[PDB]
Design a protein around this nucleic acid. Structure first.
Lengths: 82, 80, 144, 383, 123, 95, 162
RNA sequence: GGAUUUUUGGAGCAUCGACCUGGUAUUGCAGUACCUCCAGGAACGGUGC
């Protein structure tokens, strides 16, 4: 079917294999699970490594990001197309 | 016979796909392709030692999925 | 069986659905397959006879009121109320002359109709549901 | 504010509207089980709202006993009424009629043709409280309970029929020990089952049934509910017999029976209460359990196809004819025409004649191509 | 239509606390140069004002919430269900009575349209 | 076609997956090891050339460290397992 | 015109010049800020330029927000529950306000992760010892009105009001 | 649709970003990875082993 093209050009968040989450406007996709995320922001959680330290998530914006299918795990919709 | 054709003929079924990196998403699977791409709607995802979040839509890939869990009211003779 | 192909007065074929003409018979069968033909196909007595009539003697009592007639009838043992209706004197069995008045007649099923002539034009109302009453406990009929 | 006069009458009118909506729901016939369950849930929500409104109206009686001495007085009256009428003498420039004083509770407690749900119950859904395997109260899902029992027993010698036969017992011998951890699962299998008591009948009083179950557990189950002819009296907590009633009454206040054991009346009271609630739910909903067992037997005895069938249930015509061309007619109120031939056909029509009759010009053939009112008036005055 | 409804509610609240039929808080207000057209029964609003006065009189009942508390309507869902079933049975009986009255009217119209209107007798 | 199906049947009956053919012949339970150190014992209803199995009434056991790790196990009615995570498949288990 | 979810859904949400997600809401004249939870924590900066908000309150729980732009407004009072709604707030732009008393910045020290602050073009900065009181109230702020904090200013803040 | 680049699985140390103090030269028009140097303190964090 065409279920992957129904959520195109929307603010989707794809979960990476290393634990990071890339949120962006997935404009282009392919059969090899590739994604072209315009104005993408990658957020990676950091370990507290202590007893009283909290869990934080460092977020960095990269812009247009071409993510391959070897690292992409699952993609979820987060926001409508602006 | 390939097992992808048995999984492709499944719609509106509340399944649980357990991923490779300690993730498990339980929800109603709405779409399955030949590359084992599972598109589900209104699912609950639980990661490795994390709180179970709720997502309106999710699309898990074929190589990232480790195992699947089907309901008990699902015959396997008619699906193969 | 095509309901659109017809024969004209010149020995030809005419499609009334698409309004097309065809000279020979080989062009009418080839005109059904096409774009315009597919587009035109996609775009397009018992109660009256059983009533007993013995005609008994009725008892009517009239009274001039000011602000009503009382008809004493026997027991009919039915739910059908006696009905009153105002008619003209133009229709009769023998048609007498000088008949130019109106008559209000009340009729029931086991009894005969009682008619009273009204010389006035309009002094009351002869409606059934408006100004009539029939007490079945005492079997008293009134109309005003 | 008229809390005793206006608010009490408004609460009584709301209760009467809720009773009329409940009578209209009960008078209508039902065709499906899910629609009947949704109507029963809407009636239970309306009854809860009416009970909340009655509880709110029943508490507004403290100041009424002090205000009844001044309200029933005949010496007072039209002075305060004239003061309130002078207070109600504000500007009436808000020209807007509001007929929704009583029609809005009548429309809020009604349903539509596309969706048979009330306006407070518009967000209700039958799929958020029951699963697809239950069938909205038709059957009970026992696959997870059977999986939990197979995980607790650590043996694969228990099928669904064996679990249904073990769950069908009420006062027989248990399949496992009472002091083991499997009874900790037996509350959890009851924890949805009592929820089935909230699922199979939402219109029934759950609080009164829970109070009756607590009274039957306290006054009868705690005082020897199973007499005999060790076999004379049996205790569910201590799991031991008794010689007579006096010996059981003396041992009921004993030191191992109060807190000196691992299954006394202090720690194992909640497990015994959950077992009594599970027994009451099995006795009250035995027909649903029999229907679920019959459905499981019909699903096991069928083939794959039978189980799969059971689980599935034009611009060229406008450009050539002169259309889509804007034309203005100043005679008939500057109307628009999308064609010259259409305007020529509408000139000798009823609308153009009714437009020309207001100016006083007769309907003749000289004013066929007349468009402006001044030119038509000059043509009428010239002839 | 909010000001007229508020005036009708105020008149129904002031007339419900009267000790007599003619000795009310609105009969003396008519002679006090206060225009009130809702007191006359010839207006269409008088039928709503009478219903508001009846609701205000029913709100002063001893089981209405002034000196007692209702327990069967506020703490018994089975009594409310039985009252709804009795109301549905009364509505079904009223519908059956209306159907019987319509059948009797149809029978009377069938009997009136078949009788002989020419047999006139003047006594 | 028919010849490719016959070759696949011969490779499933006489090849390395013939023990998996023992899972669908006498309906015997097999034990499959996963990549997350979770051994699943159960009967196999359907298999393929890519080792994708459909298990019925399976029991998955693993070791979870809280000390000493406990043998926490679970029981699933119907499940599907991909062939990428299959490490070792034992035809005849011990118990 | 009141602010609702329709004004936030029709607004332009894009990437700002600081590489963060910002939604433009300039030219709205909203008297009160409410129903701002429709963004689903998908923004890091919220602009509220040219508004008539009398008080900065009614903010929902947003953990992804790190910048607040309340410039060109008429905020006379400040809310107290601002730290429980924005735990990751770092930038606060409260320029061109109507603050007169020094006690208005007392809930502003409730944010522990706050490092950027701007209280310029305000009557509260015209009073004596305003920057010293702002440094003594919130020590976590490193840049106040486009100026870094000083060690002598911190010593004067710790010495005064003792 | 199973053989290395995507889809039937390799599963205390070193570096960087900061935070705070003083001197120092550049006052300059661009889509720039970062952008002067020295000295002192740190009881800040990320990454791999």
């Amino acid at each position: 079917s065409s279920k992957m093209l129904q959520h195109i050009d929307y603010r989707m968040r794809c979960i990476l294999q290393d634990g990071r989450i890339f949120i962006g406007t997935f404009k282009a996709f392919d059969k090899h699970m590739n994604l072209i995320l315009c104005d993408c922001d990658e957020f990676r959680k950091i370990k507290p490594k202590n007893s009283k330290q909290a869990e934080r998530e460092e977020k960095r914006v990269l812009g247009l990001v071409l993510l391959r299918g070897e690292n992409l795990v699952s993609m979820t919709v987060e926001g409508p197309p602006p | 016979m390939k097992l992808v054709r048995f999984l492709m003929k499944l719609s509106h079924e509340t399944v649980t796909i357990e991923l490779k990196n300690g993730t498990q998403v339980h929800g109603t699977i709405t779409g399955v392709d030949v590359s084992m791409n599972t598109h589900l709607k209104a699912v609950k995802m639980t990661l490795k030692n994390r709180e179970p979040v709720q997502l309106e839509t999710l699309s898990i890939r074929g190589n990232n999925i480790r195992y699947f869990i089907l309901p008990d009211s699902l015959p396997l003779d008619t699906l193969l | 069986k095509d309901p659109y192909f017809m024969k004209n007065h010149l020995g030809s074929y005419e499609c009334k659905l698409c309004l097309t003409l065809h000279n020979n018979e080989g062009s009418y069968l080839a005109h059904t397959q096409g774009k315009k033909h597919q587009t035109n196909l996609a775009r397009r007595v018992e109660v009256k006879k059983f009533v007993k009539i013995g005609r008994p003697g009725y008892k009517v009592t009239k009274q001039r009121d000011s602000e009503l007639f009382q008809i004493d009838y026997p027991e009919i043992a039915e739910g059908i109320m006696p009905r009153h209706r105002f008619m003209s004197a133009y229709e009769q069995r023998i048609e007498p002359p000088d008949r130019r008045w109106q008559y209000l007649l009340m009729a029931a099923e086991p009894y005969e109709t009682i008619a009273f002539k009204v010389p006035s034009r309009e002094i009351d109302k002869a409606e059934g549901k408006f100004w009539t009453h029939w007490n079945r406990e005492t079997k008293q009929f009134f109309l005003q | 504010m008229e809390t005793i006069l206006e608010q009490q009458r408004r609460y009584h009118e709301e209760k009467e509207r809720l009773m009329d909506v409940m009578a209209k729901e009960m008078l209508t016939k039902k065709s499906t089980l899910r629609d009947q369950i949704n109507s029963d849930h809407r009636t239970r929500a309306m009854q809860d709202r009416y009970m909340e409104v009655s509880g709110n109206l029943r508490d507004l009686y403290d100041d009424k006993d002090g205000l009844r001495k001044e309200e029933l007085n005949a010496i007072s009256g039209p002075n305060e009424f004239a003061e309130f009428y002078n207070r109600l003498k504000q500007i009436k420039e808000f020209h807007r009629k509001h007929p929704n004083e009583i029609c809005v509770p009548m429309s809020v407690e009604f349903e539509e043709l596309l969706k048979a749900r009330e306006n407070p119950s518009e967000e209700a859904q039958n799929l958020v409280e029951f699963t697809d395997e239950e069938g909205y109260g038709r059957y009970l899902d026992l696959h997870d309970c059977y999986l939990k029992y197979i995980n607790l027993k650590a043996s694969e010698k228990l099928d669904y029929i064996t679990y249904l036969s073990i769950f069908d017992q009420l006062f027989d011998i248990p399949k496992e020990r009472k002091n083991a951890e499997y009874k900790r699962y037996l509350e959890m299998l009851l924890e949805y089952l009592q929820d089935y008591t909230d699922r199979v009948k939402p219109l029934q009083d759950q609080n009164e049934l829970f109070g009756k179950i607590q009274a039957e557990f306290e006054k009868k189950w705690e005082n020897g509910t199973f007499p005999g002819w060790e076999e004379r009296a049996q205790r569910l907590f201590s799991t031991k017999g008794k010689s007579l009633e006096s010996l059981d009454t003396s041992l009921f206040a004993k030191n191992p029976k109060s807190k000196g054991t691992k299954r006394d009346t202090e720690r194992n009271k909640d497990i015994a209460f959950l077992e009594a609630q599970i027994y009451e739910y099995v006795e009250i909903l035995g027909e649903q359990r029999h229907l679920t067992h019959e459905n499981v037997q019909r699903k096991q005895a069928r083939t794959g196809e039978e189980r799969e069938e059971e689980e599935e249930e034009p611009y060229w015509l406008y450009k050539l004819h002169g259309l889509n061309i804007n034309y203005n007619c100043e005679i008939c109120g500057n109307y628009t025409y999308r064609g010259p031939k259409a305007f020529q056909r509408h000139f000798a029509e009823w609308r153009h004649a009714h437009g020309m009759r207001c100016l006083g010009i007769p309907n003749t053939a000289h004013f066929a191509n007349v468009t402006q009112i001044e030119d038509a008036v000059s043509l009428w005055a010239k002839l | 239509s909010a000001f007229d409804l508020d005036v009708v509610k105020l008149t129904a609240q002031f007339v419900a606390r009267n000790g007599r039929q003619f000795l009310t808080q609105l009969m003396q207000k008519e002679q006090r140069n206060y225009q009130f057209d809702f007191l006359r029964p010839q207006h269409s609003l008088f039928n709503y004002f009478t219903k508001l006065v009846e609701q205000y009189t029913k709100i002063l009942i001893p089981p209405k919430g002034l000196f007692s508390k209702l327990k069967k309507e506020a703490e018994n869902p089975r009594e409310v269900l039985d009252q709804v079933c009795y109301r549905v049975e009364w509505a079904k009986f009223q519908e059956r009575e209306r159907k019987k009255e319509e059948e009797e009217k149809e029978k009377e119209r069938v009997a009136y349209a078949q009788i002989d209107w020419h047999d006139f007798v003047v006594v | 076609p028919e010849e490719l199906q016959k070759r696949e049947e011969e490779e499933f009956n006489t090849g390395p997956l013939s023990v998996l053919t023992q899972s669908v012949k006498n309906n015997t339970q097999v034990l499959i090891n996963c990549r997350n150190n979770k051994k699943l014992l159960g009967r196999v209803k359907a298999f393929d050339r890519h080792c994708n199995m459909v298990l019925e009434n399976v029991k998955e056991m693993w070791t979870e460290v809280p000390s000493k790790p406990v043998n926490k196990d679970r029981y699933i009615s119907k499940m599907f397992l991909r062939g990428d995570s299959v490490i070792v498949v034992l035809r005849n288990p011990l118990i | 015109v009141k602010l609702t979810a329709e004004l936030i859904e029709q607004a332009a949400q894009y990437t700002n010049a600081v590489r963060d997600r910002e939604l433009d809401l300039r030219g709205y004249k909203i008297p009160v800020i409410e129903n701002l939870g429709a963004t689903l924590d998908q923004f890091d900066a919220i602009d509220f330029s040219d508004n008539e908000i009398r008080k900065l309150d009614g903010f929902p729980l947003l953990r992804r927000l790190k910048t607040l732009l309340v410039n060109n407004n008429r905020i006379c009072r400040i809310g107290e529950g601002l730290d429980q709604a924005l735990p990751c707030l770092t930038e606060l732009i409260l320029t061109n306000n109507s603050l007169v008393e020094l006690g208005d910045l007392d809930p502003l020290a409730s944010l522990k992760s706050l490092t950027y602050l701007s209280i310029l073009r305000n009557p509260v900065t015209n009073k004596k010892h305003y920057r010293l009181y702002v440094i003594y109230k919130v020590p976590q702020v490193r840049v106040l009105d486009f100026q870094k904090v000083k060690l002598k200013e911190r010593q004067e803040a710790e010495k005064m009001f003792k």
